[PDB]
Write a protein that binds this ligand. Sequence first.
Ligand SMILES: Nc1nc(N)n(-c2ccccc2)n1
Length: 346
Amino acid sequence: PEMVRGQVFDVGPRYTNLSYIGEGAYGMVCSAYDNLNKVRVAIKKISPFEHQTYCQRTLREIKILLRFRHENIIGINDIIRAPTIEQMKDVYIVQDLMETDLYKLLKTQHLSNDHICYFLYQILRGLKYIHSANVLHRDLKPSNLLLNTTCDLKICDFGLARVADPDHDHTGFLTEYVATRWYRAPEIMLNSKGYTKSIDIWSVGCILAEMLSNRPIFPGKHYLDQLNHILGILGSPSQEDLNCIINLKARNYLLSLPHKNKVPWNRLFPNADSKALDLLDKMLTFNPHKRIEVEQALAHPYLEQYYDPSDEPIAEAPFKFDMELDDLPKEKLKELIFEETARFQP
Ligand SMILES: Nc1nc(N)n(-c2ccccc2)n1
């Protein structure tokens, strides 16, 4: 088999000329030449079967990415694995090769207003489809937004995604959470499990702010510091917004803080388009019930050049997990991954 930087990368006859690209949130990633379609592609090696947690993330992603079909969501072109469950130690996921991601771009490049607008449009267009299927991404951030050399954008990493469940969103103060800190909505720290769509719009607002300035807007260093960063800019919440928080520990924590006034966006981003700032304000609203939804965001005057609801598809049905998944053993999950990947076997 082909070998790469001290590891087996056996992707068989079809894919050759392997070259290390990096580590994604699963394992090693390599580019390779696809001998059938004659293009270079990206291949991610996943070795998840020695952890119930990795298997769950892997399965969830495979299931979602195979059901979705959309220009702004990364697809799966091929999946490589052994012919039998007994011999299957790794799985290889093959996808279109992208040049870069928004994280790398923001480190190194100033974006024009036209690029910002176009990128934002594509994010929201893909998010419209995801949310129409009743799915929440829950970890939107610059690293999860891939770009090719013509600035086409694709959303990736559906490992933390969930079906929306508004009825079960409530929890106590300071409840643990898994998704990337700087892009977490304020309610996650206060009273929310992140089971509603408004979680994703907050993350998109954070991303917009970062595109405007090249730096993260709420770079909290730990769980609670994330909130003080938010409040220093948005200001103290109103009585009305506090009235929505019924849990006493969360409400009384907020009442204990000194008063902070809002910092107007135009002071933070003096070069920004005023329409971009108006939309940002509506995404970065403290109260999730007052936060703009994806379809309203697409129709905002900032995006008028691109907005076309007839070219902004929705999913054909809501998405559902047949089995629970969360309470399944390793052995079962292995069998399910084997079964889901069968359609790519000769
Ligand atoms: N589909 C694709 N294209 C690239 N470069 N991908 C990549 C994603 C994360 C880390 C390294 C590479 N993924």
